[PDB]
Amino acid sequence: AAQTNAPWGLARISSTSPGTSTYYYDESAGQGSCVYVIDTGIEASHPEFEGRAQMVKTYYYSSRDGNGHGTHCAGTVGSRTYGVAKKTQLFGVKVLDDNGSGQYSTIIAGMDFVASDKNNRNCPKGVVASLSLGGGYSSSVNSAAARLQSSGVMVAVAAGNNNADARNYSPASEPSVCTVGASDRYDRRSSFSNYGSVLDIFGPGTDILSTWIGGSTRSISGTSMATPHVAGLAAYLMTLGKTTAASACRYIADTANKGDLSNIPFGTVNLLAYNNYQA
Template sequence: MQRTLLASAMCAALGLAVQSASAADLRLAQQPVPGRYIVVLKEDSARLASEASIANRRHIPEVAQVAQQIAAQSPGRRMRVLQSFNEALRGFVANNLSDDDIVRLLEDPRVDYVEEDGVVRINTTQNNATWGLDRIDQASLPLNGTYVYDTTASNVHAYIIDTGIRASHNDFGGRVSGGYSAINDGNGTHDCQGHGTHVAGTVGSATYGVAKGVRLYPVRVLGCDGSGTNSGVIAGIDWVRTNHSAPAVANMSLGGGASSAVDSAVANLSSAGVTVVVAAGNDSSSACNYSPARAPSAITVGSTTSSDSRSSFSNYGSCLDIFAPGSSILSTSNGSNSATATLSGTSMASPHVAGAAALYLAGNPSASPSQVTNALINAAVSNAVGNPGSGSPNRLLQTGADGGTNPPDPDPDPDPPGDEPCTACAKYSGSLSYSGDYDYQPDGNYYYSSGGTQRGWLRGPSNADFDLELHRWSWWGWTKVAQGISSNSSEDVTYNGSSGYYMWRVVSYSGSGNYDFYLSIP
């Protein structure tokens, strides 16, 4: 049906609305799928249909019952119900609608609104280089060449709503399970495009992932050309809401025009306890014009470059929650079981935040989506993003413990004369018996310190390789914030941070023997 007729249908419905305050409205898509509509029902309509179905002992799912009734009343019975949703929202997808069908739907007291099904696409552009993981564990530039983390989030489930995942990729280590496909092309959940595998790699691959042990689930809603429909996205959300295991995070590195149906589905997924992270979009305009970027219940992510400027393509505005690295991100790809690719886009920024959400959930498995959101926002670095865009919150993702300064040179000044590496410091001694053995210092305990410089010196046997780590208590548990990992047993570590609880860990990478540990606190 031509879209000009939609306006006529809307006018007809508005005319009827004068007589009926409950008349539904018709919502247009920015890029519609011809002849296909998402019909969203009022909650009471679905419930009453379910009760009637049970009374008649037919046990038809509640929304499908209403959809069948509505389709049966179609003039000439041309309307076809393609799919119904019970969880993401109460509604169904239909095609072959005539003008009369649309007007009749808008008049139907069981219908909340009717929305054109719209096209959604991935949010990626091609480029090269790699740096994202290095950036998110420290508060400011320059990069220090390391990514420090204290959990792999192996107890967390991540649902990648995208183009699928190449499950056999070596970097996933067999952690890709099950999943769902809304695309009926014979590929199942396999990624024939590459985007979903790249996104999943940033969330949780062993080499390129933020949460390196997370369980990954492909939810394929975009085809081999990287595009799909709003109804397909809703079908994927519906599956996640019904089948997810907790604690859970869902990443949606996709987007299209504004869609009330998609926004409602995201809200219902969040209300089921799944933290939803979405890409802001690559149009260099307000994210509030796109779905799911504008969904209030999601964490909406803009993209930054390696110099902490907003990426030129990144959307911005009041619908954003946070920025994360998104330009020139290296991750897994679908070309082979060892393939990689470097991509740019808010699609690449979003999974950094999804991975960070998984890290938080690892230590706080009962946290609600709003608690996860608040934790990430509170830990973010303020005022670090250059040219964030009008109305944007200037917050940059931070997975480190406190947003303190970078770990400086591990040995900023030489040891004082004599055998002791420091003056006015406390000395503790211990022994490690085998490779992998470890001790906590001071004396197996932690301590509270005011803000300032924490310094530790390790002196161990010359025929062994002992390492020294500093951990700080944060909102997701003990987090490694600095370390010395040279090839011998002499390590000097310095860390500038805020007040809090700290603990040192001495680890045998290889060998055994006695050691001395020296500690200086502010």
């Protein structure tokens, strides 16, 4: 399948070269997979989600996304126009308030929730969790992310936005999950992207158009935007049967475009997520 005039990041993840604008993908499109977006919520009523999104947990007085960040990330995972995996099921877990803030205890609870809740959901092709959040190093946060991964969920986490080594951030620094840095449309490391040996992969993160609250759209930047590209890619590849939750991060690294990014610090992987689709 081909989506013309797609957002640059979708085109990039289906290309061996920058500078193209069509997204190519197998029409299975993540059908039968599930992606949990652990964030500020998801505006599930957005036409772009086509009934495939739903809130399943909140730790606040409402499940509404009053911020937009979670809706944007979910849109990159699985919205019809802006999403990698256009037929996946999206589950919202609101661990962040409408200012984008949350206690680590709440974030940990949301991760443990997903590890259990996936047993209440029909996801025959596999389960992914997208975590576009983080803060300073916490062994407890890292342990929760490791538990979620171990339970059989492909965990993609943002490297962080401090132009610093991700070893000092959580859950970015947990080795067993998939830690995602950000690149721009000219194949440069995004100016803010964290780096370091703990990174597994880069995805598009600068100037990413996706869904927003109020039935709207906007372009924003961050490792938060790169992470759902990788999460959606994992769901797409799991639906194709090419990999599993336990092996998807390694598979994405194995099949990535290699050596194509600039300003990658020595010791950080030079790997850009790629779907290897051949029509």
